[PDB]
Design a binder for this molecule. Structure first.
Ligand code: HEM
Ligand code: HEM
Lengths: 394, 394
């Protein structure tokens, strides 16, 4: 007597379990139990992952429905699960997306200056250094403050919400609501602050007083600030941290990208493809009975789209575990998802990683782990896989 | 085909696995594999744990021998495993032990003032608060700086070595040697610093220039500073952190100790007994063939004394899981070990915990976890079990 297979499989973000490939081959859609005790369908082939992400009848919004089978507990108000739908409905899609491109004047230069300052401090303090807490995360935090138009000194307090806000918990989290409410109040104050004129919040502050947006709520404007800060900072910090691990573990690649920095974009795209940063499949609730591979998923059932399932699928990406900078299908991975909820910050995420790596490779060409890789402590019950500390020497 | 039972069993420090009791009943000494691939004998009854700890032919010093089966990799020079033997041999035992009692003038008051300051800052910043990183560990760090006679501002840098120094690793750790050497150099500078006249280092500085100790090495004096700082700070911070979890999880006990603060010493003794802070059994190498229960341990074999094995043994501590403040044998636990290597800082450890709890209970009588207990992230491959963060509200 064995229990139903439980998800997630491993919080380790440095290697994929051999079990993923076995499952994809045997049962590319199959029943699993989530941390709440709910049943769900885990989808692990590129073909089936794409089918689900491209069929809106597998709804993100309806995962928030009272009484649904859940992957994990809500850490935001239920209506906030539909944030992107709400933005679109408010007429704000074009504005939000424009404010979060890496193309703003001075943005990339700020990013580079910031990376280089962070690295200089590490070099001045001497090895070992923690590349997550003292490089990747502060770089992500600095970036999002600039993107939002808010003071750099406000970033740390907002950042500290995230170890709780992006938990993957069986039960509601009291601290999540405390920090949510506090952070909403902060962003509402930002909208009332006359000195905030640049970035996303500067633009939202203007649109709020524009008669063309009079009936959009102050709640929605504040919510955009909190949601985009948290989602970008957690994604970019976590991705860059684990991409640095993949790089450090491949000294031939580290050396190449160091010698030929113009291959960094192709390197980063492959680091994206192999990245294990998402701790859980992407959740969707079926709004109809829908055939997916051999399974007829029924209305009301939860589906989990396993990104590394898709991204390591040999049918789509031959020699899936190898970093190859010349694949004929290099951006066709699902690291930023697909379909209606495709990542709105994908360009900014790419550029954060490219610039961080370029800067690290230049300042620390000798960068290597300062501890055996097995000594990394992987964060558990969290929506990302990340090492608590990333000790390096150089 | 099943592998040899692997140790340790769980890094979770908030509950004991049901497997411990099963094993103690079935096989209170039995063969296990450690993280290095070595075989060892795991001892889990109070009777057998005490027998081993009280028989010096089960040697701590000889665990450092080249070619021995290992629990984990050395994180200090091999000779430093015998630090307490070296102290005794140098004539320094009486002096070291006197400098680390809680009885120094002003010490307890410093401890209380420090706890109360740390708590006030948490209260001023508002819930949630992280009781490990922002209370228990800083309190431990402040305490040891005062005990050593070194500046409070030097504590943080020394503290930052510890996440690596107390790793339980299969392989040598490069960062461990970097920080060891740096920290030794710091303590040697302290011995040359005329302004350092109090505490352990003040006394060691005096004994170093005393003709009665002329042939004791500067290496030994510096080594005492590093070893006692790390061992005390890691032990007291880790213990207090996990004791606060046990307290928080028992609101009836929290309320009692709050109402009747004079039962705190009896409370702390029971929190000691049930504490799961030691991540691994205590390692000893057999220097002879010795009968232990049903097993004849052979010369050269590794033995691991599982403290929670002893401390939850129903034969010695009836209703072992219950905190009872009136047991007839309350200090007879093995939380501080037993025999030749009994903890030299036991009184100071007790007082750190008593004072921290007294202060927390007074300032935060409403203290509770701000996240579900399962959301705590347990540090892995470490010589202590600790949550990376302990989020509370009050
Ligand atoms: C390498 C960095 C990043 C990665 C790997 C990443 C990944 C993802 C993925 C897979 C999704 C889809 C979730 C789903 O379909 O259920 C997503 C959505 C999202 N991301 Fe990103 N992201 C990154 C950076 C960013 C940045 C820089 C921002 C904003 C500044 C951002 C903001 C968002 C938001 C608001 C959503 C929700 C989209 C929706 O519901 O329609 N992300 N991200
Ligand atoms: C609640 C707090 C503490 C606990 C639970 C604890 C526990 C222990 C235990 C079980 C041992 C025995 C290890 C063995 O036999 O292999 C030990 C040894 C030791 N402890 Fe503590 N300890 C605490 C606090 C402290 C403090 C405050 C200091 C110093 C200021 C300290 C310094 C040491 C040292 C130097 C040893 C090595 C003893 C030897 O090798 O002879 N500990 N501790």
């Amino acid at each position: 007597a064995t229990v139903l297979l439980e998800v997630p499989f491993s919080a380790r973000g440095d290697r994929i379990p051999d079990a993923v490939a076995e499952l994809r081959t045997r049962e590319p859609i199959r029943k699993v139990r989530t941390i709440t005790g709910a049943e769900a369908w885990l989808v692990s082939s590129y073909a089936l992952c794409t089918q689900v992400l491209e069929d809106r009848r597998f709804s993100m919004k309806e995962t928030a429905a009272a009484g649904a089978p859940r992957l994990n507990a809500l850490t935001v108000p239920p209506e906030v699960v539909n944030n992107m739908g709400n933005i679109a409905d408010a007429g704000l899609r074009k504005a939000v997306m424009k404010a979060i491109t890496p193309k703003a004047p001075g943005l990339e230069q700020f990013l580079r200056d910031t990376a280089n300052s962070l690295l200089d401090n590490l070099i001045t303090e001497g090895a070992p250094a923690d590349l997550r807490n003292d490089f990747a995360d502060p770089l992500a935090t600095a970036l999002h403050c600039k993107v939002l138009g808010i003071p750099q000194e406000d970033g740390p307090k907002l950042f500290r919400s995230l170890s709780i806000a992006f938990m993957s918990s069986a039960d509601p989290i009291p601290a999540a609501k405390i920090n949510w409410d506090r952070d909403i109040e902060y962003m509402a104050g930002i909208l009332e602050n006359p000195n905030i004129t640049t970035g996303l919040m500067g633009e939202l502050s203007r649109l709020r007083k524009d008669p063309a947006y009079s009936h959009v709520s102050d709640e929605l404007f504040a919510t955009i600030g909190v949601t985009f800060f948290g989602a970008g900072v957690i994604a970019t910090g976590s991705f860059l941290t684990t991409a640095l691990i993949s790089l450090i573990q491949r000294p031939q690649l580290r050396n190449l990208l160091h010698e030929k920095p113009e291959l960094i974009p192709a390197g980063v795209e492959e680091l994206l493809r192999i990245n294990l940063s998402f701790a859980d499949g992407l959740p969707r609730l079926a709004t109809a009975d829908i055939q997916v591979g051999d399974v007829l998923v029924r209305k009301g059932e939860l589906v989990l789209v396993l990104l590394e399932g898709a991204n390591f699928d040999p049918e789509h990406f031959p020699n899936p575990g190898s970093i190859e900078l010349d694949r004929p299908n290099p951006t066709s991975h699902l690291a930023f998802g697909r379909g209606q909820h495709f990542c709105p910050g994908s360009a900014l995420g790419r550029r954060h990683a490219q610039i961080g790596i370029e800067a690290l490779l230049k300042k620390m060409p000798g960068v290597d782990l300062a501890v055996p890789i097995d000594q990394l402590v992987w964060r558990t019950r969290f929506q990302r896989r990340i090492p608590e500390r990333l000790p390096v020497l150089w």
